[PDB]
Structure 1
Amino acid sequence: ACPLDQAIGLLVAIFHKYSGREGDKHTLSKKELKELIQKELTIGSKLQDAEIARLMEDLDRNKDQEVNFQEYVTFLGALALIYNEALKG
């Protein structure tokens, strides 16, 4: 597949890996989203960074709210901005 098609396939795969764990496969809880981020990304060395810590805390504070696919992807974009080296500057 083309690079972007590959990217989307992976986004969908990881979403379903966690959304399929409990209830409706169309959503996952913010608690489950926090777990997903910590396990699926090599983010361990960056969790204390001021901006990433606030994103992670927001998830904890709203742990029982559900997240659909659209919101999950939007979230990944937000994280990428403060997590991806290429997006610095």
Structure 2
Amino acid sequence: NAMETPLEKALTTMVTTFHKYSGREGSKLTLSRKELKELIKKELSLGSSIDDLMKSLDKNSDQEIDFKEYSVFLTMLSMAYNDFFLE
């Protein structure tokens, strides 16, 4: 939909990126650690601290990252750039 604003397209990409990787194993509604790392490896530039990331994110302790837990991860990455924003 070309008529979506730049922000709308961004938010859409955040949502589709989750579901692109959550449907590889297990529930398609959640990311396993394997699935998380594969989104991290392929979609981000972050190349034992995953499993620590995994734990910080898994607020319900169910071993899986759902959409609300992934949104917190995205905000972490956003804030890291916002902290040092130079106009």
TM-superposed CA distance for 1:60, in Å, is: 5.9
- Larger RCO, structures 1/2 (Cα 8 Å, 6+ apart): 1
**Amino acid paired to 1:73:** S
| 1:53-72 alpha-carbon deviations (Å, 9 max, x no partner) | 85x3513668x810110110
Q: 1:8 aligns with which of 6, 11, 14?
A: 11
Q: 1:75 aligns with which of 47, 69, 73?
A: 73
TM-superposed CA distance for 1:35, in Å, is: 2.5
Distance 1:80 1:40 in 2: 14
Q: 1:66 aligns with which of 52, 64, 67?
A: 64
Structure number with bigger Rg: 2
Which residue does 2:43 correspond to in 1?
Answer: 40
Unaligned 5+ segments in structure 2 are 57-61
Deviates more, 1:72-81 or 1:14-23: 72-81
Contact (CA 8 Å) 2:21, 2:31: kept in 1 or not? yes
Output the TM-score relative to the length of structure 2. Answer: 0.68
Output the TM-score relative to the length of structure 1. Answer: 0.67
